DNA sequence: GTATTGACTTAAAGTCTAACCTATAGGATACTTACCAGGGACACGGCG
């Protein structure tokens, strides 16, 4: 499941190289420590490979949520709450779950409403947030890189 | 030099319209008790 020099995606940071791994003897026992590095934060995170999948951490995903994500950004006919702090709540907690999902439906419905008629800073910061971590994320799906990632965001977001 | 009229242009209003401040309201997971002096004089509570 985990493999040396694996690009492993990480929440919230999205990318995280893996280095290796460290025995680490806690309370007697050799709990595995795998290290991972992301490029974001210059930060090295050790997680146990045996509830390493409980805390989130998800392989690169293939073709098939790439396909998901571009269906889902043409997902039309999107309502929310009247009161602006429900929606905010509803779209912080869907960025917080990790779900490319989620995260994906939140940027593309508050990109299109910025774009609509422009917001507001708190609204702009989770955008510029979300819109981050996908670009990474999408980067490394295809290893297609951060600058032409950007770029296939900014074409297929158009419809 | 000191008495005028007829134009000829000009700043100061005086006012109508538009945007950019201003007073105000609201927001529904749940959260329930903060934080180095002395030296003299006068007044208040205890004890006998």
Do not use: C
């Not at 050799?30 to 509830?51: I, S």
């Not at 929310?80 to 989620?102: F, H, I, Q």
């Amino acid at each position: 499941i985990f493999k040396v020099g694996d690009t492993v995606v990480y929440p919230h940071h999205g990318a995280a190289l893996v280095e290796a791994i460290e025995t680490r003897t806690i309370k007697g026992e050799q709990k595995e420590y795998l290290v991972l590095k992301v490029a974001q934060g210059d930060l090295t995170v050790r997680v146990p490979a045996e509830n390493a999948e409980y805390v989130g951490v998800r392989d690169v995903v293939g073709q098939e949520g790439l396909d998901k994500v571009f269906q889902v950004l043409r997902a039309p006919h999107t309502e929310e709450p009247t009161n602006w702090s429900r929606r905010y709540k509803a779209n912080l907690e869907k960025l917080a779950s990790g779900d490319v999902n989620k995260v994906a439906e939140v940027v593309r419905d508050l990109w299109r409403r910025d774009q609509e008629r422009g917001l507001s800073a708190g609204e702009k910061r989770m955008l510029a947030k979300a819109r981050q971590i996908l670009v990474g994320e999408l980067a490394l799906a295809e290893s297609t890189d951060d600058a032409k990632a950007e770029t296939i965001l900014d074409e297929v977001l158009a419809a």
